[PDB]
Amino acid sequence: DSAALDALTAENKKLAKQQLEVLARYLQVDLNKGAKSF
Amino acid sequence: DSAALDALTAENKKLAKQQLEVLARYLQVDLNKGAKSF
Amino acid sequence: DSAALDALTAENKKLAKQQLEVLARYLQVDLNKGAKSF
Numbered sequence: 001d002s003a004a005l006d007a008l009t010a011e012n013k014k015l016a017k018q019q020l021e022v023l024a025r026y027l028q029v030d031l032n033k034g035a036k037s038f
Numbered sequence: 039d040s041a042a043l044d045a046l047t048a049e050n051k052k053l054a055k056q057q058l059e060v061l062a063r064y065l066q067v068d069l070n071k072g073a074k075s076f
Numbered sequence: 077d078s079a080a081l082d083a084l085t086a087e088n089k090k091l092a093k094q095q096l097e098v099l100a101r102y103l104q105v106d107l108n109k110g111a112k113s114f
Contacts, residue, residue, distance in 0.1 A: 001078065002078055002081075005078060005080065005081055005084065008084075009084055012084075012088065013065060016061055016064055016065050016091075017065060019061060020058055020061045020062060020065065020067075023054055023057060023058045023061065024058060026054055027051060027054050027055060027058065029058075031069065031072075032072060033072065033073075034069075034070060034071065034072020034073035034074075034075070034076050035071075035072035035075070035076075036072075037072070037073070037076035038072050038073075038075035038076040049102070052102075053098070053102045056098040056101070056102075057095065057098060060091070060094040060095060060098060063094070064087070064090075064091045064094075
């Protein structure tokens with residue numbers, strides 16, 4: 001029940017989020033065009 | 039005017055696409071929820 | 077003794093496994109040619 005394991009999981013997810021961001025930015029892919037149309 | 043440079047660019051973009059795919063899959067992030075709602 | 081830390085480790089290893097998979101797929105590298113010959 002370490003309420004720090006959750007933190008490092010959140011950190012890893014944040015790292016992955018950032019990586020996804022720049023990947024998409026490279027691909028000229030909008031991650032929200034679906035949301036804009038919605 | 040090498041119509042193979044375009045190919046390797048397409049290959050790199052495909053690699054990046056795949057990487058983005060598995061990244062999102064890790065993040066439990068739907069890339070089409072916007073499109074579903076739309 | 078959190079039997080969830082092991083889980084997130086397994087998740088990270090699965091992410092890395094997948095990334096390795098698509099990397100190899102890009103490199104046209106068989107990860108089992110050794111095993112086939114064996």
